[PDB]
Write a protein that binds this ligand. Structure first.
Ligand code: EFZ
Ligand code: CA
Lengths: 400, 543
RNA sequence: GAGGCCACAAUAACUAUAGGCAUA
DNA sequence: GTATGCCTATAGTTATTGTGGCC
């Protein structure tokens, strides 16, 4: 086995377990029993003081998720600087990419003995009527970032035969997932995937349809005092993202204490300012470029009526990417879907996961995010109050 | 034979080397007498100069330094069960192991750290040195290691006896069954004989306690649970320490006694105060303290959990950001009760705090019963869909239904979405100085009217609300207001029914009386008409 | 050798992120 | 121009007091 360590000053994960419903506790005892028979995990004593949360997911029966967000952090030099998997820039340019689970490809590989204690997790019991069942991994765990890093070697050697017979196709691996980059058509794509599923059994997204979209301002016959006041507040705010935006000639029109309903004729100087503000928005933004050394950030706003706006950026107001998502459904189900859609988008494009700013209370999210989660990764997230001008501004994007 | 759990000190640390102070002669005779017994039974061993370590005698000996040097463990009392969670049983007994630690061996390599000395009377002469062979009292690792031993000692018995429920809790076993008492008593004795194979003693039938069992401050019957009776003293002078323990007893009551409120007494404890400061009760505390004192005359009890039925949670508003709930399965037979009080003071409207209360109860239901309840809330299903579709944050509740028990939960006013044709347009502003804490509020109207008052001892935030207070006060039933204060505009869209500031629910009364109000925001300092004029008036003497 | 340990609550104090206002 | 100064959020954290316990 490959020796793994931590940073020399780091301690092991000591994360508390969020409480679980009885339906999921029963499902987890089943799953971990069979994993104990098959040698994959082992019960441990109380002399092991580390813990890592464990959850249950449906993902198209049940499934065990281990939230290793804290352990990955404490081994990040190991799986990033040392054995890291480099990113294919050509992946996002494929006309179509589909996603493959290769989770079961880790269970064969043994795990370094001195490192298994850091991987401890605790099935809890209802009402604390029972001590809590404590396993630890004996093999490479699904969801630890060291796992594909270590399986890296044996993954090149298991695909070179396919990749030699298709050196056009690009395929990239983040965690327990494979990404198949192709330009072939829908028929000659799905045939290729079910071939590769048989090449591996031996041992539905299109990034081009994603497009940053332009802001569109109202188009009005009769502008009113109120209409303009609303519009300069929005434009004044968006001059932080488009600095070539001005409101000088629109405020000249609001001279003296006018009633809110009064109609204002657009002077030619105003009508010009407006017409180029429009042109600055209908074209891209500039000076914004991806930085490999900084964290991606993703912020979602609730728009109402089952639709949502997001932005991926690295410094305030410099959005690498923005978009919209819309809908027997509730906010949490929708929010959970956006977070997964935004993440896989962010995965193919940059090979990284964004840290989310979520417009929900932490307690509520901790309760229900597990209901509709289907991914093997879980991203970093935090809980924010969306300011009103941010909601108002990104409403005005256009729809595909 | 119970195998030892391997234990290590924390990386870099060495074992304790604390000095033994000399002790009274009457103290020494008592130590040598019980130390020679523990030696006779193999619990401790005499040692010699080969051992560099030592801990001082006290719980026989005090292991402060050693516990600081011992590795961490995954601690076993993560949380206490709650009585509501337990299922009704027919026959329950409690066994207490009495040679608990004495019967678990200590990892061989760790024993050298437990060394301790009985000093000599003359003290010129050296003393007797000993070390532990079994889990010592007061050692950080004893509880978790004992619990791990007990858990595997009971696993054969548990598999052989599926219907019996053994709950381990420190040195105690709590055993329940639906067997009838005779056949219960037979199983209890097989369990005693099992524990006895590994040398664990337990009270025989003649010595076992009868229901009810006192546990963790609860009184546990086989069919119901209660708390031990709650005394709160009657004084005329009240020190801050006294109000601390008042709030403590009430908070402990609120799990079974419904409708307890403490937020009035907690408000007395805000800010620093030496514990003997004789604080006089605000009188609306005595109101709440009266209501609470009589609620505790009532008899109460909780029932146990029937898994085959649904859980129901019903919430009532007690007012002033105070709420109370009950959980039951069959009507008027409560499992437990609780309270929820926002006390951030943050401006939050009742619809939101309500949603917060349900989120606390959902979390607690999953801890205690492993499933979420069905809710009965004093809020209309359209009033809720009104708020939570206009609100910026997401939420989600499980099944809930309206229930009509006043006071209900309504949105006190409704601001217009578009500007009101034919309504006077007010342009408001405030301004204050930090240095002189002095400021002005005012407005300017499209119909020619204007007004400026000077306030004293304010902040910029306060003056911007005062100016809105003036426009609403000097205007008709339909107004358009424009402010430049994102603060004032925000604190009014969210509609805080309660508050600590008089000025803000003052304003909320004004908005209640009004028929149509439209509230708009423009950015400050941009030459926008109306705002410019009023900003000139308000900031004249101020900046 | 001036009790530690757990759950909950209250009070106080300080870290980050975002937002606001103000002033130089 | 670029920095500090004061408030509000969403979170995290260390300390005290208290209720109920235990050793
Ligand atoms: O599930 C049940 N039902 C129940 C009813 C009454 C009593 Cl008094 C005790 C129980 C029991 C327990 C317990 C711990 C809180 C001590 C028992 F383990 F069976 F003792 O657990
Ligand atoms: Ca102002």
């Amino acid at each position: 086995t490959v020796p793994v360590k931590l940073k020399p000053g780091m301690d092991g994960p000591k994360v508390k377990q969020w409480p679980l419903t009885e339906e999921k506790i029963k499902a987890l005892v089943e799953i971990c029993t069979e994993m104990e028979k098959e040698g994959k995990i082992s019960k441990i004593g109380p002399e092991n003081p580390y813990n890592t949360p464990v959850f249950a997911i449906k993902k198209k029966k049940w499934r065990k998720l281990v939230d290793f967000r804290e352990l990955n952090k404490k081994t990040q030099d190991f799986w990033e600087v040392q054995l890291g998997i480099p990113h294919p820039a050509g992946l996002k340019k494929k006309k179509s990419v589909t996603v493959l689970d290769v989770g079961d490809a880790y269970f064969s590989v043994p795990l370094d003995e001195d490192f298994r204690k850091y991987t401890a997790f605790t099935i809890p019991s209802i009402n604390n009527e029972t001590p809590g069942i404590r396993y630890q991994y004996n093999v490479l765990p699904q969801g630890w970032k060291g796992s594909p890093a270590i399986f890296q070697s044996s993954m090149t050697k298991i695909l070179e035969p396919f990749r030699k017979q298709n050196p056009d196709i690009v395929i990239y691996q983040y965690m327990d997932d494979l990404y198949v980059g192709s330009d072939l058509e829908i028929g000659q794509h799905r045939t290729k995937i079910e071939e590769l599923r048989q090449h591996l059994l031996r041992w539905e997204l299109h990034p081009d349809k994603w497009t940053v979209q332009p802001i569109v301002l109202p188009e009005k016959d009769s502008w009113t005092v109120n209409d303009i006041q609303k519009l300069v507040g929005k434009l004044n705010w968006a001059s932080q993202i488009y600095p070539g935006i001005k409101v000088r000639q629109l405020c000249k029109l609001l001279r003296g204490t006018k009633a809110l309903t009064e109609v204002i004729p657009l002077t030619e100087e105003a009508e010009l300012e407006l017409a180029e503000n429009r042109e600055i928005l209908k074209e891209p933004v500039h000076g914004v470029y991806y930085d490999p050394s900084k964290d991606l950030i993703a912020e979602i706003q609730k728009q109402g009526q089952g639709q949502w706006t997001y932005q991926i950026y690295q410094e305030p107001f410099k959005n690498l990417k923005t978009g919209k998502y819309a809908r027997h459904t509730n906010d949490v189900k929708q929010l959970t879907e956006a977070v997964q859609k935004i993440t896989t988008e962010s995965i193919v494009i940059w090979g990284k996961t964004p840290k989310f700013k979520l417009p929900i209370q932490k307690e509520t999210w901790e309760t229900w995010w597990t209901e509709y989660w289907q991914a093997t990764w879980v991203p970093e997230w935090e809980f924010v109050n969306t300011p009103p001008l941010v909601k108002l501004w990104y409403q005005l994007e256009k729809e595909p | 034979p119970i195998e030892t759990v391997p234990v290590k000190l924390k990386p870099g640390m060495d074992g304790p080397k604390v000095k033994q102070w000399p002790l009274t002669e009457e103290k020494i005779k008592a130590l040598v007498e019980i130390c020679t017994e523990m030696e006779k039974e193999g619990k401790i061993s005499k040692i010699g100069p080969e051992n560099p370590y030592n801990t001082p005698v006290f719980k026989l000996v005090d292991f402060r330094e050693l516990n600081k040097k011992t590795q961490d463990f995954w601690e076993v009392q993560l949380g206490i069960p709650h009585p509501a969670g337990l299922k009704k049983k027919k026959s329950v007994t409690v066994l207490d192991v009495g040679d608990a630690y004495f019967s678990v061996p200590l990892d061989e390599d760790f024993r050298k750290y437990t060394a301790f000395t009985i000093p000599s009377i003359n003290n010129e002469t050296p003393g007797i040195r000993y070390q532990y062979n079994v889990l010592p009292q007061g050692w950080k690792g004893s509880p978790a290691i004992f619990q791990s031993s007990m858990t595997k000692i009971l696993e054969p018995f548990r598999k052989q006896n599926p219907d019996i429920v053994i709950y381990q809790y420190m040195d105690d076993l709590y055993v329940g069954s639906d067997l009838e008492i005779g056949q219960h008593r037979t199983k209890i004795e097989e369990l005693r004989q099992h524990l006895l194979r590994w040398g664990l003693t337990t009270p025989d039938k003649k010595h076992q306690k009868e229901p009810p069992f006192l546990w963790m401050g609860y009184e546990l019957h086989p069919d119901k649970w209660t708390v031990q009776p709650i005394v709160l003293p009657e004084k005329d002078s009240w020190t801050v320490n006294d109000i601390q323990k008042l709030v403590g007893k009430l908070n402990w009551a609120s799990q079974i006694y419904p409708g307890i409120k403490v937020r009035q007494l907690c408000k007395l404890l805000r800010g620093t105060k030496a514990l003997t400061e004789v604080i006089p009760l605000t009188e609306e505390a005595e109101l709440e303290l009266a209501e609470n004192r009589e609620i505790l005359k009532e008899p109460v009890h909780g029932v146990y959990y029937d898994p085959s039925k649904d859980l129901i949670a019903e919430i009532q508003k007690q007012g002033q950001g105070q709420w109370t709930y009950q959980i039951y399965q069959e009507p008027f037979k409560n499992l437990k009760t609780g309270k929820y009080a926002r006390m951030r003071g943050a401006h939050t409207n009742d619809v939101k705090q309500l949603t917060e209360a349900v989120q606390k109860i959902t979390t607690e239901s999953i801890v205690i019963w492993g499933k979420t309840p069905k809710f009965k809330l004093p809020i209309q299903k359209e009033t809720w869909e009104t708020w939570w579709t206009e609100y910026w944050q997401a939420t989600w509740v499980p099944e809930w239904e309206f229930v009509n028990t006043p006071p209900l939960v309504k949105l006190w006013y409704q601001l217009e979405k578009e500007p009101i044709v034919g309504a006077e347009t007010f342009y408001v502003d405030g301004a204050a100085s930090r240095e002189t804490k002095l400021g002005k509020a005012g407005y300017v109207t499209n119909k020619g009217r204007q007004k400026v008052v000077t306030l004293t001892d304010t902040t910029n935030q306060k003056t911007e609300l005062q100016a809105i207070h003036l426009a609403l006060q000097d205007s008709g039933l339909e107004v358009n207001i424009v402010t430049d204060s994102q603060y004032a505009l925000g604190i009014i869209q969210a509609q805080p029914d309660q508050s600590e500031s008089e000025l803000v629910n003052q304003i909320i009364e004004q908005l209640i009386k009004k028929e149509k109000v439209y509230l708009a925001w423009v950015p400050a300092h941009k030459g926008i008409g109306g705002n410019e004029q009023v900003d000139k008036l308000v900031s004249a003497g101020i900046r």
